[model samples]
Structure formats: C-alpha cells, structure tokens
Target chain A: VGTFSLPALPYAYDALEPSISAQIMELHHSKHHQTYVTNLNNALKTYSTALAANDVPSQIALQAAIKFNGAGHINHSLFWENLCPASSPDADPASAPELTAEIAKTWGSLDKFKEAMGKALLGIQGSGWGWLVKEGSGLRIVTTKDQDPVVGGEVPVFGIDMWEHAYYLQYLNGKAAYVDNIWKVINWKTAEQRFK
Target chain B: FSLPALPYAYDALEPSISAQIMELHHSKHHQTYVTNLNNALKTYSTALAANDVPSQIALQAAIKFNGAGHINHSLFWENLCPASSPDADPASAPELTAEIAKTWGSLDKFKEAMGKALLGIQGSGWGWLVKEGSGLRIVTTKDQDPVVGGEVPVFGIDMWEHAYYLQYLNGKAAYVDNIWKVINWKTAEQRFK
Candidate 1:
C-alpha cells in the first residue's frame, strides 16, 4: 500500500558521528537507505505483477529480487531502529543480566563477548551480519548473508551490520575503529527491553 | 569503513592465518563483495524503476551471490573472538543443549559431528548449527548458500578457501581441529531457544 520512503532514525544521524563519521551517516542513510527503499518498491511491484498473472517463471526468477530488496528493506528497517544516534557510553548497564551472565559463565565475561563480536565482524570474508540473536532459548552469535533473518528461536536481541557501506565512508580501511565506536550508538535500552 | 580492522594486528592469528592472507581476504575478497552488492542493488533499482519484472528476476542470482557473501563475511569476523577469550559452553543453552542432545546424542557427539561435517566438506563450505522443523542440527552448505531456505542459524564455522586458506592452506582438517580450541561454546550455548 505504501511506497517506500526514508524512515527517521530513533536518534539524530549526527548522534553517532564521532564513532561513525557524519559523512558516513549521510551516505548510509541518504544513499544506501534510499537505494534499498527504491529497489524494494520496484521488486515488490514486479513480484505482485508476476503473481497476478500467475507467472511461475517470473516468480521463480524474481525470488532473488524479492529476497534481496525485501531483505534489504526489512533488515535496514530494523537496523535503523536498532541503532541510536544518541551517545550512550554504556549500551546497557543492567540489561539482559540473565543472558549476559549466562554468556559470562560460558565465555568468562562481557568483555569476552565484545571480543567475540569483534572477531566475528572481522572474520566475515564477505558481506553478512554479526548477530547476538536468540537461538532456542539461550544466546548465540549467528551470522547471515543478504537479509536472511534468524528464524526459529533466533530473535535478534542485538545485531551488528557488517555491510561495507556500514563503515566504508569513515573507516575506509579502518573497520576496527568503526566497530569499536559503534558501541557508542547501540540502542541498549531497546535491547534490554527486548531481552526481557 | 573500508575494511574492518582485525582486533589485533593482521598477524595476530599468525601461522593460523597469515598476514598476507588476512590482508587479501579483507581488502580484496571481502571488498569485492561490498562492491558487487552495491552494483546489484543499483541494477535492481533500474529494473524496478522501469517496472521490469523480467529484468529484476534476472539479477537475483548475482544479488544473492554478492549479498550473501557480504553477510557471511561479516558474521565470520564475529565468530572468531580473541583466542584468549573463553569459549561459550554448550551446556548453558538449555534448548540448544537439548536439541543437540536429541539430535546428536550429546555435546561431544555434536562437536564431533560438526567437526567431522566441517572437515568433510569436499571443497569449501560452512558447517552450521541450524533449526530444521523445530530442532537444531549440524548441517553444511557449500559456496554461499547461507543455510539454504531460511533455516535459523545458531552457530557456524566457515571452511571455505578464504576462511582456512590463510593458515590451513588446503589443510582444512588441521584448521578445523584448531578452531575448537578457541570456540566460544558459551556463545553457541546461548543461541538456544
């Protein structure tokens, strides 16, 4: 019903600037988000038409289109809200205690979790996501490519976007800086509530 | 960011993953994925703008290949936290634990299966802990399938050339063996229902 339109950030884009440069934010939001929105609308229209005509070939062929644009649209939509432009030194002070404590008991500490997240983010040989998603009933780090959300018991308590576009503008060749800084903008309050 | 910085230096994983391999994988291989995904999205946009379903459909494979590549690489980075960190113990995640127990017998068996399936991948692929029909099982997918058909992923280990080529150099067995030492089983355990 609604054509794609740019969505507002929960916080100001510049809110994440020091860690994520304003220029990067500008491109990420304006250029990247806009592209996903435009493509998603197009893909949906194409998909709707094929279905209306009962075209199997068209449907099968457009699966990727539907997946990519749809995924991009869905992922970014969630991603935008998942991030906060507001500066928060600590993502969560007393949140997801059960989950965090559970992870600590397993990995040793919250710091270990950060280290693990860092490695996974860097280990990605190509495009994908670094998710601290819920699997079954506990916490697990899951990675997905091209918009595949963690289904089943995999609820996304929190996630990190690894698309180069996510950090390219500011970090150029400095992804660690981007990742380290991202901690500043995460919507931990939201994550805390989600965990509950 | 151009390419994410390795938490440690390029040589941190040294011997296991060479500096050269890390550099190329990060700068060259992974960069290509980002480039291609952007282009693919653009092409999809053109098709959409023109209301061309046929054209949009045609771009699907390329999009998946590139897009999935990007997504997978990103996750690969996080999967390998500092070796110094403890592994996520599997016992803590009750659902994942039960599923593993039910599906593979026990944690040892599950690890054995994952390791075997991981090393067993003929050429290049990923051994994943995924949910199929309501249970989590260890499964493997080759060359960018990303747990095909939306299977919920719990944990994954990439055995692709790029993944192990840096250190293992065609010796995926050795690489797989070593990865266990640094595994965050705690992370794996947490990813349960």
Candidate 2:
C-alpha cells in the first residue's frame, strides 16, 4: 500500500501568478512532486521487504532512498500547504501576529527575517532547503542539504525550496527575484499555526 | 546524434580515470543525455509544428540539460587519450601552448587558473577553456550548462561529483591534478586553431 499520496494544491495553479508562474506550479506539482511520491512509495515498500528478510546490507542501502524520497514528500507537502494566493488575506503578515512578533523579536523586523532566510537560500550551493524553524522559544533560519528535513526537535515553521527545479523554469539564474516574490504568497496563517 | 564511442579503450584513461568510472560515465550517464536530447527534440518539433508556446517553454529546460550534456560529453571523449599518447603532451600542441603562454604567461599558470575555477564551482558544473575574442577565457557553468553565445568552448573539464567520485573518492583535487596527464592536447590545439 502507498502510505502517502500527492496532495491537491490549496489554490489554482495560477493563483500565485506573476510571483510564481502557473506553468512552473503545474510542472512542480505534476512532474517533480509526483515523482517524489512515486519513488518514496517504491522505496518504502522495498525497505519493509528488506527489513522482513533481515537483509542488513539491503536495509542499509535502502536507507538513503527512503530518507531522500520520504523527506521530499513531506517537504513538498509542507511547501504546498504554506503557500497561498498572493491576493489572499491569509498571505498577510497581520494574519500571523504571534508568529510575526516572534520573527520580529528574533530578527529585529519582518523584512530582516526574510533577508536572513533569503541569504540562507542563496547560500545553498546545491539542491537544498531554507527553513525558518522554531527552536526552544527562539526562531532561526537553517539550511539542509538535498532532501534532508528539518530535524533536532526544531519545529519547521516554514521552508523555502532552493533546488534549481523549484524556480529555474520561471526564474532562470535570477534566483534572488524568486526569493523576493516568494514573500507575496507565503501563507502566514499557516505559519502561525505551525509555530504554535 | 547518439552516444558516441570512445576513441581509446575505456581502461586507457586508467590511474587518472578508472575503467569503472569511464564505463559508467559514458555508457550510462552520458547515454542518458543522448536519449533525453532526442526525446526533447522530437517533442520540440511537435510543439513547434503546432505553434504551442507553452509547450515550447516547458521543453526548453529538458533540451538545455540534454543538449548540453550530449555536446559536453561528446567533446569530452575526444578531449582525452591514453596518458602515454603523444597527443597528451602540451609540447605537441605548440600553437595552442604558445597562445596560452602569451595570455596566462605559462601553461602551468593557465592550468592552475582552470583548476581553481573548477573547484570554485559550488555545484554540479564544468570548467571550460573557451575561445573569446582573440584569447582564451576560463569559465564555469552551473549544472549541465554549456558555454554558448558565440564563445567557442575548446574543451570542458567536468566537475560533477560523478566525474571524479568513482575514482578519486573525496580526493577531488587529485582528480583535477591528474586529469592533465590524459588530456588530448591534439584536440585542444585543433579546436583552438
């Protein structure tokens, strides 16, 4: 049984238009995200089979595939859920007062918080993610290589994908523009819920 | 058009590049580009026939990745020879070496510059010695990108982890340092002229 499947996006593909393209969203969800779902299921089944047989080498070999694809599934799901139409009220920072206040307290201002996240995102040398995570009572920006998820008990309040495929079709090498526009569609309401 | 055959034996690039590395890189990863490139072109033709702009846009990335891959690896095979071959000697490439000496002041210096460029690339990419204006320029392209826009790329040194990891493991610099031993200066000289 495929324990997880692709989740439908909360808004129409074009809902984040101009900031992020409809074509990109279509490609990201249908092609990239779906492939991760398919691969994760395939790997999970193989891992279970290896475990049943006590095939230690196979289990060890299977760990990477499971972690990469499993993390891709969760990260993509979280990413999709935490984005809203740029025009939606949920996209407003005011909708996330507690989280916004915490972010401001941690980073001095909302804009500076984004600057930190954006810097972290751009600093990624290869496929990775930039996360705004809640650690203990404070917030910090963290980067993960490849598909490794946010860990170490830090609650991943929100994450920004830095993989080329995430924005290359729409942004080309101007990755900074994608980072700037990404702010327009972030679901701050969900950020609040995730933070608390 | 398709995966081109290597001019020398797969094992010929040994010590610097192992047979295991050449076999996997050329037969599998290199061929992957050829097949995908062909597929992308076929889809492009279909989209162009229909004048579908959206379809064309969707297909651009696929073509860019595969097209550059095919071009890069096709040249890469020709850009190598047995370490013992005369073509591997920079002295055998007088004109190109003369030009390199004029620009970078010495061949070793040029190589040092290129190696640094290759290492400085933060992700998957290639280091190219490209013909620009009347001299050569060393540049790095990120993630399967090739030198384009009228710049003639003499040859590219792949920095992708797959290019060295199989043979050098974590010794990436070792791979870069040793690659010169197998370089086909004949091809580089020919391309330069």
Candidate 3:
C-alpha cells in the first residue's frame, strides 16, 4: 500500500520570485500541499477499510476526498517541478526544439498558445486547472473544474493552477498578471519531458 | 439588480455564524455575484437582440454561474435564523416533521445524512435538502450551481469558505454542525407543504 507524502521543492523558495513569491511557494507547499498529502493518506485508509468491508456507499462517498486531495498532491507536485529560477537559463525562451515545433504546429506560435491558455485560465469560474494536454497527436488547451485531474483520456503536457490560493495573495484577483508572469519561470524542459 | 437585504440583522445569527461573516458574505460576496449576474444578463440580452449566435452561446456559462449564485444566495438567506427563532426545529411544523421522519426514519438520521453530504463536498458549494421526485433527499452542488433536475429546494446551507472561514477557519465540520442550530425549518416546511 502506498502512502502520499509532500514532495520537496526542486529549488530554493525564492528561486521563482518576481513570478511566484517565496511566501506563496512556502504556504502552497508546506501548508496547502502538505494538508492534501495528509488528508489523502487518511482518506485512503478509510477507502481501504470500506473496500475490505464491501461498503459501497462509503467507498462512493470517499471518491470526492480521494479525487480532491489526490489531485491536489499530484497537481502541486507537478506545479513545483514545472517552475525554475527566473535567472536560470532554462527559464528564458525555454522551449525544447521538438516541443516548440509541436506547439507551433498546433497553435501557429508559442505566444498564441500562451495567450489562448491565459484566456482559458482567466475564464475559469472557480478553482480549477488550465492544461495543455496531448490528445492523440495534437496539443489542446483545456480547463478542468476543481481538483479534476487531466484524465479526459489526454495526457497533461503542461498545466497551470487556477485556484485562487495559487495567486490571490500576490495577484489579488488580477489573474492575468499571474498568467503573464508565470511563463517567465516555466520549466519548459520538464514540460517537454512530459510531452515525450 | 441590487443586493437583497438580509431578513434579520447581521448580528442575528451570531456565535453560530459570526456577524462579520454575515456582513461580508451578504454585503460583499453575495453583492458581487448579484452585480456580475446583472451585468451578464444585460450582455446576454444584447447578444440576443443582435442575433449573435457565438456570443450568445458563450454567455450561457456566465448566465448559469452568476444566475445560480444569485438564486442560491437568495434562498440561503431565507433558510437561516437565530437559534431562538421558532423555525429552528421540526417540532414547529408537524407536517414537515412527519415527512422527514418518513424519509429518514428520524430527524436525527436525516441531520446526520445531510451533514455527511455537506462535509463530502470537495469544494465550495451548498448542502441542500430538496424535494426530488416526490421524496426528500440531501444533495450538494459545487460552486454556485443552482439545484437542477427539477428538484425543489426546501433547505440550503452555503458551504463556501467565505460562508464561515472567519469563524471556523479550517474547522468546516464545526461550522456545518453549528449551522443546524439556525436552520429555518419554517421555511423548509413552507417549501414542502
């Protein structure tokens, strides 16, 4: 049986500063992500017990808990890995050649893809994720409602967290600014690795 | 077009839900939803007049989201009262009490089931006790989604963080537990009968 645990940040807390502040990263990881990991472990325990007992209703009831906290852990883990220090060379115009060609083929240009993704992120009604996913051989931008993972038969190549907690302390409802600045710190190599 | 005034004073439901939460939830959060819904409706009407199909289709989401927020908040305000109010318990409405008993075998069981449903909601939403297909059932709707599928809402408890975050912090269960103290059984009975 596997238990969930909070993953460590790949770089220093302030590494992505001027894009995502150290405070946001600290709370997002230590507090928010940690809570999800802990709750997910707890839910799994109950889920196991319910399964053993053939308690269908309890199992059904725990689905939301599993999905919300499980995706919270999964998404946040990916989120941390997909950011690099703003000053890192990998952070600037950081697109792998193949990924860039694929993006260009899909959306005409990287800037256009970013703009469309940013618009989709902005249009999210509540907590959610904006994902650039691999659907068959094509790249598509899609939004999923709160804690819904990229599980619509598409593999997530890149995703941006759209939950208020992701940007509220720094952006204060100005999500467009967060969306615009995040590209500066995006770890294109990590996204490219996922695309493969 | 404007905010709906709270039926009771902001402080009326105090201790169960803080006066501060009521003030902000009603005056600010609910007000924002109403204002946005009004703006969306105006835009939707214009799209309709101009016969702009794409814009009309696009505006439907805004209409559903904001429209549901408005309707839910309006019903939410009516579904709560101070603990001292006669509407707090099923004893005041025998017809509603009988139905609740018939449905769940007892009010205690019903309350437990409803609380479980409320706590199970993964995100911001409402816990509702509604009339569905000639019976009462507990259901939850995520975010500001209105009770759909022709279910007639008898009771609703707002589970948005803004609904109780000030008083409860991360103690959502405590807030859900305490909300029953002020639930307007009178309004529920009115809806039922």
Candidate 4:
C-alpha cells in the first residue's frame, strides 16, 4: 500500500455543489486529485530506489515530480475539508468568531477581507491556490503557483483553488462568479480550528 | 507579411467550433503573435548591433514567446482542415499511417494517447506528436512554448482552454475526439517526409 492514500471527502461530492458543481468535485477529487496521489506514490518509490543506489543525480531530478505531486496531495487534502454546504451552520461566519475578528482587524472589515481575497484569487495568472495564512500574529492573503504550498513559517488557515479545473466547467469565463460563490461554502469552523 | 490568412472560411469548423472562436483565434490571437514577434525582432536587432547584451537578455522572453507563437500557430493553421476535406483523411498519408500503426498499434490508440497527454496538462499548453530519432513521441509545451531541440513536430493540439472553451465548455474529451476529423493529415505527411 502507498504511504499516502487519498482521503475521502468529508461530505458527498454534491454537498458543496451549486457553489462547486458535483461534476467538478467528482473529477477534481476522483481524477485530478487521485492522479497526484498515485504519481506521488510512484515518485516516492523511485526516490527510495535512488537512495538505495546512492544515485545522487536521480534523487536530485526526482525532486520535481516529488514536490509537484506531493504538494498536490497536500493542497487537495486541505481543500476538501475547507468547504461545507452554504446552508450548513458550520459555514456561518460565527463559527469562526475569533478568526473573524482577526480578519476584520487585518482588513478593516469582513467584506473587505473577502474582497481582498477574491482579488488575489482572480489575479492568479495560472494554476495556483489563494490562501489565507497566519502571517505573524495577523492574517494575510497570498497565492502560490502550480501546487506550491505556503512557506516561511506561514500557517495556511484556508485556501481557495484557482486552477481552471477548479471552476472552468461551471463558471467558464465567469471566474469572478466562482470567486463570489465560493465564499458561501467555506467552512468557517474548519478555518477557526486551523487558525488556532 | 508575417501573418498568413486561413486557407478556409472561419466558420468552416462549425458545430465542433464556432466561427466566433475561430475568428478570434486567427485574427486576434495569432495576429498578436505576428505583430509582437516583428516588434521584438526589430528591437533585438538594435540591441545586438549596438552590443547591448543586457537589453538583449531582457528581450529574450518576448522574442521566444512571440516567435514561438508565430511559428506554432503558422504550423497549427495549416495542419487543420475542414472536416469534409479530402486532406483530412488519414489515408492521404499512407506512410505516416503505417508508422503510427506500427508504433501505437492503431490510429485510435495513438489518438487516445495524445488525448490523455492533452488532458493531463495542469494549465495552458499545446500537445504535440513529434518525431524523435526514428520514433514518435507525445510531448507538451507550457503556455505558448513550442516543440524544441531538434524534434520534428508532426502535429499539435492547442490544449489552451481558449482553443475550445466557448464551444466545448469543459467538454475537452469531446473536442479531442472530434479534432481528428479536421486534422490536415496530408500536411502532416509532408512534414514527416
């Protein structure tokens, strides 16, 4: 068995839908996410073989596949739990009261904080994630390209996928709509726990 | 003069593609390449002649992108045909067909391999079937990057969402399935030779 296996979605694929379609979720999780997991496992196996042979160049070259696939696995694992049905109580901003206050203080208001994050999400030029990370004692928004995760001691509080596969099916060119609707399904409860 | 017009009507690829997408692809997208490439070459010449190495370095990306865009799209246009064209038939390229069959077992199999590579792209790219040594390979180029380093590009599918989004939405598999209908295999054959 692979050391890393796909984590099952906490909710049904449709549970996050309307905000994220069942179709996109199904493929995102089943196909795209699964591909990363499978490829990562293969890369890890190869890395171990390289280590056994003391093949320094093989180890060096395998880092690209390892990092890309490993980060993909890490990012999607967080992303699934990062969402909830818009109708769920867990989606309420109150569920993350402490985090909400910090967000308000950081950005002047909750609406402003959301606006800032949405802009960051849309500003992404290619495949990436927009993150709300704990930088210092305050919160800030950041984006990472092509499966790169947050670093420099930043704690990822929540993130929104900006990859075209994340929204192209339902939103087409109306990516702003995806940026708008995603706020509805964000699991504030999960964000609060992570913020700690 | 760098920009060449399409051989067929813009609407010639309809049902599978809309005239709107086709027009924008050639008229706007491909022309921007030709326009930008000429501008970059003009500046690069000045930089080279003046021995401004830093300026030449600064201008490298513009030249590569616009230049590759020019060459890639020029090749892309000719390698596509109206679905009903006699040139669209794989039979028109018997030698290439035999090689493809020998390599991938069958045309359907080769296409399936190409489609998988196209869909595997994480972001904007083009998928190419190229001749490497005595064999064929399927490779991807990110953004506007083209096949490079001595590989002979046989044909390429523009996996950029802009290529099919308006018509296919997220139905890329459908787009991939239908592309063979319009591929200018006769042009592909000439390249292989």
When only the first chain is scored, the TM-scores of the models are 0.87, 0.94, 0.92, 0.96
lDDT of 3: 0.83
Q: Write the per-residue lDDT of candidate 1 for residues B1-193, one digit (tens) a residue.
A: 2456654566655555567766777777788778877777777877898999876775786687777777777766555544555553444466667777887788788878888888655334678887787777778886776777868766778776556543544355787777765455566665554
Number of the top candidate by DockQ? 3
Tell me how far the alpha carbon of residue A144 in candidate 1 is from the true structure, in angstroms, after superposition: 1.1
Give the Å error, residue B142, model 2.
Answer: 12
DockQ of each: 0.02, 0.05, 0.22, 0.19
| TM-score of chain B, candidates 1 onward in order | 0.76, 0.90, 0.90, 0.90
lDDT of 3 by residue, A82-166 (tens): 8898777667545567788899888899899899999999888767889888899888999888778887679887789987667
Fnat by candidate, in order: 0.00, 0.06, 0.06, 0.15
TM-score of each: 0.50, 0.55, 0.79, 0.68
Better-scoring candidate (TM-score), 1 or 2: 2
Model 3 regions more than 4 Å off: A11-32, A39-69, A84-91, A95-110, A136-138, A165-185, B8-24, B44-51, B82-108, B133-135, B165-170
User: What is the C-alpha lDDT profile of model 1 across A1-196, one tens digit per residue?
Assistant: 4777778766666777677777667666776667768867787788888989999898876776666666666677777666765446335535456667666866688788888988788766445678787666677777786457667567887778876667754565457887887877777666666666
A140 Cα displacement, candidate 4 (Å): 1.8
